[PDB]
Write a protein that binds this ligand. Structure first.
Ligand SMILES: [Mg+2]
Ligand SMILES: [Zn+2]
Ligand SMILES: [Zn+2]
Ligand SMILES: [Zn+2]
Lengths: 171, 142, 112, 97, 81, 538, 36, 262
RNA sequence: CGAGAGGAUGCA
DNA sequence: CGCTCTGCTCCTTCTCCCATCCTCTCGA
DNA sequence: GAGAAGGAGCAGAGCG
């Protein structure tokens, strides 16, 4: 799901950036560094609340060089998965072994081992949906998925969405 | 939990539609800061304008995330969101549970219990039946 | 009382050869040996046998014997000693390092 | 030339801490090490060419820190670990407030 | 705890040295100069000039044993050294 | 990756499971080498690679930026850690010997006071002095609150042996006698409770008694025990490398003897040998006779030897060390030199350098210096581009071709008024080191104003001093404002000025200021002009 | 160092291994700082 | 060995001394918070001299003949003589000095009257006299109220501590008790008229100048005193000596034990 | 590469 | 008289001693 | 060969 959490981040500035512009410039740098972040602790970082009134908290000048470190505090919106969650998502891509669906900012694979036993891949369909049962799932159609844990990766975060359940079925 | 402000703020189980509303407000304020420097279809297109006018477009996933979240947005009218917030939170429902009901479509109490195991064991179905029908009525209005 | 006696006793030794050093330097020494509620010598069996940071204690007269004692006792050093920082090679919190220098963003903008 | 123990004492007296650091680091022994946040040990695989880090035995790939210490200091700890002692280094004081 | 700071208003020799060194380092790195140049190519002399007339944009944090601290703007401090 | 600084240090003992977890490989063979390759079970590429081999456990970077990684040795039998043999003895004197509890408990008033001690080090110290006197762990102990009631605490309820130190092993003398089984001690320690750790000062997560007995040895990688090629590709590897090979052979034999028929006795000695080697490896200098000797006949240098003692890895490489950007030579006097000045041999200034930064205020001067080149004095050696391109002006005509850019560094030679630091060994006190202003002179010795020798305790009879050149801009200011000679005219040691007029200069003042001295006009005019501060008024 | 080759001696030990010795000479002029 | 004992002793911003563990050693460095480098021996004129002599050098009586103030000393003559109000100020001043006189007799039993103290007052007065060649041959424009009030105001500015609680203030009073005893001694109203015939402008200049000089001599926080004390003892130690080793090492078995009974 | 030896260097 | 128990004494067991330079030699 | 920390042993007064 999505949560609002006060997060902190440390930024170091080269001396050349020690001009009056830092008020807005450091907020900017925070925005580039923070926006669009993937992390197992906090899942996906979506947006930073209160884009003004950001907590600079005074720069700390290092002794090695003229760069100054800033402990930036900010409120931001993050997305997190939980084991055994239900999501009203949609199919992103089709595959013989299952489907890939969108779960907010996260990609979930809907594996054939966990779609209904009566539901089987139908290569003939275009897209090649699963059509052997009433649960017709395709890229264009919506899908409720059942998050079977989380599988985080360095580049991104993904999980497994099961459909073989009394709920969280197709569409 | 505790925020970084020294304040013991409890976990914010933010709802999907209310999350979208908050993000829209944040994008509007971001465009404002730059200046100092509804149906799901209308909302989806409008946000993309804010995202394009507030970000550089590098992070398309958030644009996708908002677009697909808007498609499944269940309480688009912010004013109606206030009702569901009161409907669920006023009952003492655990925030983790509140977000699910206020983000996922559900008709009957058993369906909510069926979908959410945590509710199945301790929740009052009578409130579910009352609230879910109220929210279901609100859901149809969109 | 002994602390006063110690100062007088040490004072005689220094003044005996005609030399003179400021009262403060003696006073600090005698005070240190009595801060522990008793005449603590300055040997490996006195000053060394303190509760100070283990890493700092390592360099006085015993090195490996102290390490084992710490590991057995799960000792923890606060890193406020000068030598500790020296071993880690960090700016000891002394003199020029006894404080932190931070950018006054307010003044910077206020000045143009 | 030897900058022995007696030498630094005078610098300590003057209080010229910053210069002392330069002599003890910049002159010689400068070295960088990676340390696991969970366990304060130099047990980090540094795939700098791939910008990938990992601490086997902790399954940690996020709690890595660059630290500058005298190369002799690294040798000291590595010998200590061979001695079955655990010099755990932590970058965050336990006494918060 | 800026309200009723307990440290002396005068400026210590060590912190004088630290401020001068740091500001000179900033000048060497093309940091913004706040005083007109009379040909003092010496960055240290530039920093000395800056300090003499209180143009350094730095704030010093004095620490107390208990871990608390006081914050002082270099303008606030009085220099007699 | 993130940068930080050390804030606190925590010590403790390895968990053997942790040791195995960290290890990137298991050592199995004593052989280090068909001609150049290394045995996978020792000094393999998974440890610190040898030069030109960018593996270091797939860490590449040769040795420049990559340390080593620890190995693992699975010992056949547990052995006692030498440093804790006495400590292990003390704890075993307090435990209930196959019960896991302490010989005595809190139900006695004394232990409550001892258990009330805040200092952990004193805590067990008081307890040990008390428990060691107890010789029985009876199950039922009369309660102080109810003497008629006895606390059924002692699980064993039996007596205990008296423990005696036997070289590398302990002997349990039962009041009715045998060598204590190292394995049993693990069982006794494993029975200890966390509550007991608090009484014994042990940390539940950092130092547990059972971990005081070595079941696996962390093998340091080659960087700790560097490979030696002193002679024509001759190994002569460090003692530790040979020492470990011995332990492997000892351990391998102990396993071999057990497997091959279990000749019980032969296993007994082999255990002592393994106990002997491990003890010597960690420390080859014990109270007892046992003394490992290298095949050359010299004693084997154990790790403690490398670390303990002056010129060890503490006092000889951390409290002090060899430094560069420094000079040493003989000194001489010069009355024509100001206090804060010093004559530096012209050659030395052409060797030491300073990393000055290219800025709009000095680009012109630096440009010329690079044009001069390292050969002439007022020149520089290396031009450092922002990317780290240390262009060596010595081996390039580019001295007349490079165009400097802002942010680059130039290894400027020492020039006049550069603040530098002196020191006369021994540096007895603060005044033994001050900062001066360089003055380049064409003769091979340092020059001082006559009057600065009093604090230095110097002497022109052939004494030497050490010259140190700061490298960072901050340091220059730091010295010029704290350690400059004039700042130390008056010392806090005795509230007295340290310098004055000495030797001939002092005598001249007596004659000069004597009542009957008169100076002719011709002499006076010259004498005035010498005073650089004269206002021109006769 | 600095100097000129004074006399080169080529010989052999009892083992037939050729040995070379080179003596180099130079003049030391009393300089500023030399001890007396 | 010695330097390691004091390797980590330093003065903190609260003007106290602590080791690496934060344990206190002295609540005020050197018991006065004054830097050793700015201390030079000075006389304590109130200790010596016979009581009659002491009365002679300070006592002033505007009513009687024993200690009549000479009118020529000041532009104001009879205006001062007979003014009981001023006589009260002189009494407390004279009484105040008397308390110091007996007080110091306990601080220094032997009666020695030359101790290291900050700020050389003797030098300051001479500068004022020769600053603009004060005419020592004419009456001055000073007034006893100004002299007395100036002294009291001066004592209020000698801040070595800054805390506003009684505990800190109480130490602040003690940290300069000895010094202010010197201050009153050489700035006594009488001495400011006969021996130091200062003018009002000079007198004000002195009051301002002394404060600046005194404050500069305050120990700077962060002075690594521990090392300094060790070295300051080691150097004379290079020149009794076995005895010093006998003290640092407690060495219960002293070589030559001896008493001294009075 | 370690070990050893020599010469020291500095005192009212 | 019986038995305990801190006091005091008689052996062991280590543990540490100015910083530098500046060499040549010897044998693994 | 010198001094401090450890360990063992005689030992005489007090309680049962
Ligand atoms: Mg000499
Ligand atoms: Zn780890
Ligand atoms: Zn590697
Ligand atoms: Zn037992």
């Amino acid at each position: 799901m999505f949560f609002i959490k006060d997060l902190s981040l440390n930024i170091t500035l080269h001396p050349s950036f020690f001009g009056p512009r830092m008020k807005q410039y450091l907020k900017t740098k925070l925005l580039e560094e923070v926006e669009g972040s993937c992390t197992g602790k906090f899942g996906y970082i979506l947006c930073v609340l209160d884009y003004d009134n950001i907590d600079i908290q005074r720069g700390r000048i290092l002794p090695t060089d003229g760069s100054a470190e800033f402990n930036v505090k900010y409120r931001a919106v993050v997305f997190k998965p939980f084991k055994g969650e239900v999501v009203d998502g949609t199919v992103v891509s089709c595959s013989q072994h299952g489907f890939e669906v969108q779960v907010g900012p996260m990609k979930v694979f809907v594996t054939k081992h966990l779609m209904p036993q009566d539901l089987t891949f139908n290569a003939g369909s275009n897209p090649p949906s699963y059509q052997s049962s009433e649960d017709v799932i395709t890229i264009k159609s919506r899908i409720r998925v059942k998050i079977e844990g989380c599988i985080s990766q360095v580049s991104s975060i993904h999980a497994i969405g099961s459909i073989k359940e009394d709920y969280l079925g197709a569409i | 939990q505790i925020n970084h402000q020294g304040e013991e703020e409890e976990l914010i189980a933010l709802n999907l539609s209310e999350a979208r509303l908050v993000i829209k407000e944040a994008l509007v304020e971001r465009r404002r800061a730059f200046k100092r420097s509804e149906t799901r279809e209308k909302e989806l297109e409008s946000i993309d304008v804010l995202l394009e006018q507030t970000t550089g477009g590098n992070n398309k996933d958030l644009k996708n995330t908002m677009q697909y979240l808007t498609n499944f947005s269940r309480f688009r009218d912010q004013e109606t969101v206030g009702a569901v917030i009161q409907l669920l939170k006023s009952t003492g429902l655990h925030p983790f549970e509140v977000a699910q009901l206020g983000s996922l479509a559900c008709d009957t109490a058993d369906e909510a219990k069926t979908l959410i195991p945590s509710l199945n064991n301790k929740i009052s179905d009578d409130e579910l039946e009352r609230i879910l029908k109220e929210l279901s009525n609100l859901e149809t209005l969109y | 009382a002994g602390r006063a006696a110690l100062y007088k006793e040490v004072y005689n030794v220094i003044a005996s050869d005609g030399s003179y050093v400021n009262y403060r330097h003696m006073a600090l020494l005698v005070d240190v040996m009595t801060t522990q509620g008793g005449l603590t010598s300055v040997t490996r069996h006195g000053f060394n046998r303190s509760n100070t940071g283990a890493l700092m204690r390592c360099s006085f007269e015993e090195t490996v014997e102290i390490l084992f004692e710490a590991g057995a006792s799960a000792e923890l050093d606060d890193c406020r000693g000068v030598s500790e920082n020296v071993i880690l090679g960090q700016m000891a919190p002394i003199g020029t390092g006894a404080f932190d220098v931070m950018i006054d963003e307010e003044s910077l903008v206020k000045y143009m | 030339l030897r900058f022995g123990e007696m030498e630094r004492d005078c610098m300590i007296a003057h209080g010229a801490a910053s210069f002392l650091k330069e002599r003890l680091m910049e002159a010689s022994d400068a070295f960088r090490v990676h340390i696991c946040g969970i366990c304060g040990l130099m047990t980090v695989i540094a795939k700098l060419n791939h910008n990938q880090f990992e601490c086997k035995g902790c399954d940690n790939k996020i709690d890595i820190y660059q630290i500058h210490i005298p190369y002799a200091a690294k040798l000291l700890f590595q010998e200590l670990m061979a001695m079955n002692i655990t010099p755990r280094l932590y970058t965050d004081r336990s006494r918060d407030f | 705890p800026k309200d009723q700071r307990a440290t002396t208003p005068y400026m210590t020799k060590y912190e004088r040295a630290r401020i001068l060194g740091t500001r000179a380092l900033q000048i060497s790195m093309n940091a913004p100069v706040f005083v007109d140049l009379e040909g003092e190519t010496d960055p240290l002399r530039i920093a000395m000039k800056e300090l003499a007339e209180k143009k350094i944009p730095l704030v010093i944090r004095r620490y107390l044993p208990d871990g608390s601290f006081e914050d002082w703007s270099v303008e606030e401090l009085i220099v007699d050294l | 990756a993130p940068l930080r600084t050390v804030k606190e240090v925590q010590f403790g003992l390895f968990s053997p499971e942790e040791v195995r977890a960290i290890s990137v490989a298991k050592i199995r063979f004593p052989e280090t080498m068909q001609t150049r390759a290394k045995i996978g079970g020792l000094n393999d590429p998974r440890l610190g690679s040898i030069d030109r081999n960018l593996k270091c456990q797939t860490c590449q970077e040769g040795m420049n930026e990559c340390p080593g990684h620890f190995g693992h040795i699975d010992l056949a039998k547990p052995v006692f850690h030498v440093g804790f043999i006495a400590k292990i003895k003390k704890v075993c004197e307090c435990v209930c010997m196959h019960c896991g509890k302490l010989l005595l408990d809190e139900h006695n008033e004394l232990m409550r006071q001892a258990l009330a001690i805040k200092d952990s080090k004193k805590r067990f110290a008081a307890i040990w002095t008390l428990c060691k006197t107890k010789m029985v762990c009876e199950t039922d102990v009369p309660s102080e609150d109810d003497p008629t009631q006895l606390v059924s605490r002692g699980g064993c309820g039996n007596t205990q042996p008296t423990i005696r130190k036997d070289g590398l092993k302990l002997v349990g003398s039962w009041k009715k006698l045998r060598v204590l089984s190292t394995e049993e001690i693990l069982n006794i320690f494993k029975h200890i409770s966390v509550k007991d750790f608090t009484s014994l000062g042990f940390n539940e997560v950092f130092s547990r008694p059972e971990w005081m007995i070595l079941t696996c040895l962390p093998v340091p990688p080659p960087p700790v025990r560097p490979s030696i090629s002193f002679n024509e590709s001759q190994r002569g590897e460090d003692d530790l490398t040979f020492k470990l090979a011995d332990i492997l052979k000892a351990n391998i034999s102990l396993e071999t003897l057990e497997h091959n028929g279990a000749p019980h006795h032969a296993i007994e000695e082999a255990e002592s040998l393994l106990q002997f080697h491990v003890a010597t490896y960690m420390d080859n200098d014990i109270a007892g006779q046992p003394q490992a000797l290298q095949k050359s006949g010299r004693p084997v240098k154990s790790i403690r030897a490398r670390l303990k003692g002056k010129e060890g890895r503490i006092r000889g490489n951390l409290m002090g060390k060899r430094v560069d950007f420094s000079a040493r030579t003989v000194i001489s006097g010069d009355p024509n030199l100001e206090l804060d000045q010093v004559g530096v041999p012209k050659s030395i200034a052409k060797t030491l350098t300073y990393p000055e930064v290219v800025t709009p205020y000095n680009i012109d001067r630096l440009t010329q210096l690079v044009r001069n080149g390292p050969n002439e004095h007022p020149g520089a050696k290396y031009v450092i581009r922002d990317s780290g391109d240390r262009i060596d002006l010595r081996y390039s005509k580019r001295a007349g071709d490079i165009q400097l850019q802002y942010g680059w560094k130039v290894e400027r030679h020492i020039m006049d008024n550069d603040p530098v630091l002196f020191n006369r060994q021994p540096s007895l006190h603060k005044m033994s080191m001050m900062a001066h202003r360089v003055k380049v002179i064409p003769y091979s010795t340092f020059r001082l104003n006559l009057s600065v020798t009093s604090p230095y305790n110097a002497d022109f009879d052939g004494d030497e001093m050490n010259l140190h050149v700061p490298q960072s801009e901050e340091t220059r200011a730091e010295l010029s404002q704290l350690c400059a000679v004039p700042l130390q005219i008056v010392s806090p040691q005795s509230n007295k000025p340290c310098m004055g007029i000495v030797q001939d200069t002092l005598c001249g003042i007596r004659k000069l200021t004597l009542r009957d001295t008169f100076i002719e006009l011709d002499q006076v005019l010259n004498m005035l002009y010498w005073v650089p501060d004269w206002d021109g008024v006769i | 160092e600095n100097g000129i080759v004074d006399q080169v001696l080529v010989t052999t030990n009892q083992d037939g291994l050729k040995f070379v010795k080179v003596r180099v000479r130079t003049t030391k002029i009393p300089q500023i700082g030399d001890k007396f | 060995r010695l330097v390691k004992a004091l390797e980590d002793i330093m003065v903190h911003y609260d003007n106290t001394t602590r080791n690496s563990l934060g344990n206190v050693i002295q609540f005020i460095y050197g018991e006065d918070g004054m830097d050793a480098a700015h201390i030079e021996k000075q006389s304590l004129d109130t200790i010596g001299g016979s009581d009659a002599a002491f009365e002679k050098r300070y006592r002033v009586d505007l009513l009687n003949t024993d200690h009549t103030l000479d009118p020529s000393l000041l532009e104001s003559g009879s205006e001062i003589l007979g003014d009981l109000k001023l006589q009260v100020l002189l009494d407390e001043e004279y009484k105040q000095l008397v308390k110091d006189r007996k007080f110091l007799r306990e601080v220094f039993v032997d009666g020695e009257a030359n101790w290291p103290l900050p700020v050389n007052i003797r030098r300051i007065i001479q500068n004022a006299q020769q600053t603009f060649h004060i005419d020592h041959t004419k009456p001055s424009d000073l007034t006893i109220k100004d002299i007395v009030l100036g002294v009291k105001d001066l004592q209020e500015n000698l801040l070595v501590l800054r805390g506003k609680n009684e505990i800190i203030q109480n130490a602040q009073r003690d940290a300069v008790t000895l010094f202010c005893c010197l201050l009153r001694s050489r700035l006594a109203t009488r001495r400011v008229l006969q021996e130091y015939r200062l003018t009002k402008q000079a007198f004000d200049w002195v009051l301002s100048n002394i404060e600046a000089q005194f404050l500069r001599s305050v120990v700077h926080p962060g002075e690594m005193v521990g090392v300094l004390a060790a070295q300051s003892i080691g150097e004379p130690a290079t020149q009794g000596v076995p005895r010093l080793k006998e003290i640092l090492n407690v060495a219960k078995n002293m070589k030559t034990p001896s008493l001294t009974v009075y």
